[PDB]
Amino acid sequence: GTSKLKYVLQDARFFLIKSNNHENVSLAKAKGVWSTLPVNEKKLNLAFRSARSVILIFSVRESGKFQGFARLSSESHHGGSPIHWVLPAGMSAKMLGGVFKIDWICRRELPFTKSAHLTNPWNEHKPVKIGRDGQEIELECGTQLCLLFPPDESIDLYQVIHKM
Ligand SMILES: CNc1nc(Cl)nc2c1ncn2[C@@H]1CCCCO1
């Protein structure tokens, strides 16, 4: 069903996450972690304290799709297990040092063609697929985008709900 998903998305904030490569999104799905550039890291840390749920919606650049979405379960933290990110042209591990823990809500893909009817008020009502890494998505647009994804029947949202 969709009832527990709607409960998790209640009063959530949504952020677009753009990755330069598929390898880091696969690593993120396997390990439950994400790292971003310092400007977005500060934005996400502020949002984590302010909202019942912060939702990251992932899109690999040039893929024409979203690769899934996840809930932040922690603020960023330094040290800890070193994540072996594949680094873009000039993106040292120092610029990705903060690690957020995340709980995946959906690991299924959604092609951009299926979201063409959704526009983001916080990006000049451009289609929601358009936006820079870290772009915030307004509540109503973000909720409807997350409901567009195929159900991920391998995920049990019971444990996610207890962390709210
Ligand atoms: C493990 N996290 C990341 N992995 C990769 Cl490949 N790229 C990233 C990541 N976080 C931010 N970016 C941005 C996307 C816009 C252009 C500069 O890079």
Ligand 1 atom closest to Cα of residue 86: 6
CA 4 to chain centre: 18
Ligand 1 atom closest to Cα of residue 87: 6
Domain 1-164 CATH superfamily: ph1033 like domains (3.10.590.10)
Kindly state the greatest CA–CA separation across the chain.
43
Spacing, Cα 33 to ligand 1 middle (Å): 13
Strands 68-72 and 100-106: antiparallel
Q: Bin 29: left if φ > 0, else alpha if -120 < ψ < 50, else beta.
A: alpha
d(CA 13, CA 143): 9
Reported structure resolution in angstroms = 1.7
Q: Which helix (H) or strand (E) element contains residue 83?
A: none
d(CA 48, CA 83): 21
Neighbours of 49 (CB within 10 A): 8
d(CA 76, CA 126): 30
**Structure method:** X-ray
Sign of CA dihedral 155, 5, 107, 83: negative
Strands 13-19 and 54-60: parallel
Neighbours of 39 (CB within 10 A): 9
118 in Cβ contact with 125 (< 8 Å): no
Q: Which amino acid is it at 64? A: G
